[PDB]
Amino acid sequence: TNLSDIIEKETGKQLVIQESILMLPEEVEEVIGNKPESDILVHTAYDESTDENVMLLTSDAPEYKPWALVIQDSNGENKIKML
């Protein structure tokens, strides 16, 4: 998919993307340090090769504009890439 393709562009891996979860802008801002201009969808995929969760943040439908990618490791440390 579009969203799996973005994850693969950014990680080099083909992963199963979970059904989206909606986050309000202030919710997202606490996590990321930037406040999105509207609601965010979190599309999560587990990267078993590294035991990492990969979270693709887009705007809501129908645009699904990519906004950020969060990769969390098993120690619970986040890396963020703004898209």
From Swiss-Prot:
Pfam families: UDI
Taxonomic superkingdom: Viruses
Summary of the function given for this chain in its UniProt record: This protein binds specifically and reversibly to the host uracil-DNA glycosylase, preventing removal of uracil residues from PBS2 DNA by the host uracil-excision repair system.
Record protein name field: Uracil-DNA glycosylase inhibitor
Encoding gene per record: UGI
